[PDB]
Amino acid sequence: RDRHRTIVVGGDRDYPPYEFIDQNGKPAGYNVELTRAIAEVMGMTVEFRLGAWSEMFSALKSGRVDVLQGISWSEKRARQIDFTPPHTIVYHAIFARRDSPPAAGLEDLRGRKVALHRDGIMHEYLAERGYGKDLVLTPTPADALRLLAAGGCDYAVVAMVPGMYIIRENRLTNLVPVARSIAAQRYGYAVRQGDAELLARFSEGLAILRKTGQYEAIRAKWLGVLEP
Ligand code: NA
């Protein structure tokens, strides 16, 4: 009916290990497992619709999906959607080819060519700092890392964990994370502004998973995934 009305879950089709469509064409990842677990304790029915990230924010407001299982919090962002508490903290890192000159911080990236996720927290963050001219935008963080690997740019800034997972999966073995633990993010579910029902439905499920131990059980599965 209303509570039995299938909840449609949006997410990025290419953001491992948090969320991604796997080789078998199946929704997979930490977020997915978390969402399925929540659906189970809250008695919800969910449909996963993972897609290009450049349109999931829209689709939330557009109502094409009812919630996003994995999105980083930000002021500009809170002004249009409501976030539940976060289920994880996402650190970023600066990646470079091994040979290349190391950088100890993102200020050292001024004047250098830099790849990064199209409109992710770091895109916005480095734009607001005059980097925009010296930076290439990619559909996925992995595309950013491929360009770096291919000597197609000088550095890349992407979420640490996905970075490592991507380096392994796509065999970008000339890449190393040089500048680590910089710019931590609060990552979690989010629903359309003023949808306190759904919002509370998810927050409660998350809170429940944390008190029963299922949350940590799921998190321990995905190495490197941190908790708030
Ligand atoms: Na809000």
From TrEMBL:
Gene Ontology molecular function terms on file? phosphorelay sensor kinase activity
Q: Which domain of life is it from?
A: Bacteria
Q: Name one GO biological process term.
A: signal transduction
Q: Which UniProt keywords apply?
A: Kinase, Membrane, Phosphoprotein, Transferase, Transmembrane, Transmembrane helix
This chain belongs to the protein called histidine kinase
Its source organism is Geobacter sulfurreducens (strain ATCC 51573 / DSM 12127 / PCA)
Taxonomic placement? Bacteria, Pseudomonadati, Thermodesulfobacteriota, Desulfuromonadia, Geobacterales
Which residues of the entire protein appear here: the answer is 52 to 279 of 590
